[PDB]
Curated annotation (Swiss-Prot), chains A, B, C, D, E:
UniProt tissue specificity: Highly expressed in presynaptic terminals in the central nervous system. Expressed principally in brain.
Gene (UniProt): SNCA
Post-translational modification: Phosphorylated, predominantly on serine residues. Phosphorylation by CK1 appears to occur on residues distinct from the residue phosphorylated by other kinases.
Binding site for Cu cation: 13
Location(s) in or outside the cell: Cytoplasm; Membrane; Nucleus; Synapse
Name recorded for this polypeptide: Alpha-synuclein
Reported impact of residue 9 to K: In PARK1 and DLB; significant increase in binding to negatively charged phospholipid liposomes; increases oligomerization
Start and stop residues of the Sequence repeats: 5-19, 20-30
Disease tied to this protein: Genetic alterations of SNCA resulting in aberrant polymerization into fibrils, are associated with several neurodegenerative diseases (synucleinopathies). SNCA fibrillar aggregates represent the major non A-beta component of Alzheimer disease amyloid plaque, and a major component of Lewy body inclusions. They are also found within Lewy body (LB)-like intraneuronal inclusions, glial inclusions and axonal spheroids in neurodegeneration with brain iron accumulation type 1. Parkinson disease 1, autosomal dominant: A complex neurodegenerative disorder characterized by bradykinesia, resting tremor, muscular rigidity and postural instability. Additional features are characteristic postural abnormalities, dysautonomia, dystonic cramps, and dementia. The pathology of Parkinson disease involves the loss of dopaminergic neurons in the substantia nigra and the presence of Lewy bodies (intraneuronal accumulations of aggregated proteins), in surviving neurons in various areas of the brain.
Record-stated family: Belongs to the synuclein family.
Domain notes: The 'non A-beta component of Alzheimer disease amyloid plaque' domain (NAC domain) is involved in fibrils formation. The middle hydrophobic region forms the core of the filaments. The C-terminus may regulate aggregation and determine the diameter of the filaments.
Protein source organism: Homo sapiens (Human)
Role: Neuronal protein that plays several roles in synaptic activity such as regulation of synaptic vesicle trafficking and subsequent neurotransmitter release. Participates as a monomer in synaptic vesicle exocytosis by enhancing vesicle priming, fusion and dilation of exocytotic fusion pores. Mechanistically, acts by increasing local Ca(2+) release from microdomains which is essential for the enhancement of ATP-induced exocytosis.
Segments forming a coiled coil: none
Positions of region (4 X 11 AA tandem repeats of [EGS]-K-T-K-[EQ]-[GQ]-V-X(4)): 1-30
Amino acid sequence: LYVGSKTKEGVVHGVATVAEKTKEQVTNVGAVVTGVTAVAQKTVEGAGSIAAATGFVKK
Amino acid sequence: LYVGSKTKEGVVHGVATVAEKTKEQVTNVGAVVTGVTAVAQKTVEGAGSIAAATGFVKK
Amino acid sequence: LYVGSKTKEGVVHGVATVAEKTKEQVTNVGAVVTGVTAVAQKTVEGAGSIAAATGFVKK
Amino acid sequence: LYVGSKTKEGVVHGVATVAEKTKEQVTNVGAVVTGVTAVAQKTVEGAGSIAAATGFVKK
Amino acid sequence: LYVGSKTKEGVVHGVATVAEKTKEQVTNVGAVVTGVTAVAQKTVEGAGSIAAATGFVKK
């Protein structure tokens, strides 16, 4: 049993990003996720998330 | 049992980022996630998250 | 049982970042996460998070 | 049982960062996380976090 | 049972950082974390955190 000589899993490569000008405003009362950039994940025998917003959980 | 000579898992490579000018404002009353950049994760036999916002949990 | 000669897991490589000017403001009453940059994690037999905001937990 | 000749886990490499000018303001009443940069973690048989904000816990 | 000739776990390498000018202000009434830079952690059979803010815990 073998796995590949060059194996790439959950990978980000070679990202550029420019904001030559920007305005951003957020208002929140009682979830916000913003700007999440160049992100890499691997999960094994368990769940994964990368930008998760839940406003509220009630039980 | 073998795993690959060059194996890459949950990897970020070669990121550039410029803000030549920026304004950002946040207001929050009672979750905000912002600017999360160039992030790498691996998890094994357990869950993962990278930008998680929950406004509130109530039980 | 063998694991790869060059094995990379949960890795950040080669990040550049410039703010040639910036303004940032935050106001919070009763969670905020900002600017999280160039971050690497591995977890084994246990959970992971990297930018987690919970406004409040109540029980 | 063997693990790789060059094995890298939870690693940050080669980060540059410039603020040629910046203003930042924070106001908080009753959690804020900011500027978290170039961070590396590994955890084994136990959980991990890197930028975690909880506004309050009540029980 | 063997572990790799060059093994790197929870490592930061080769960080540069400049603030050619900066202003920062914080106001807090009743948690703030800022500027956390170039940080490396490993934990075994126990939990880990690197920038953790809890506004208050009440029981």
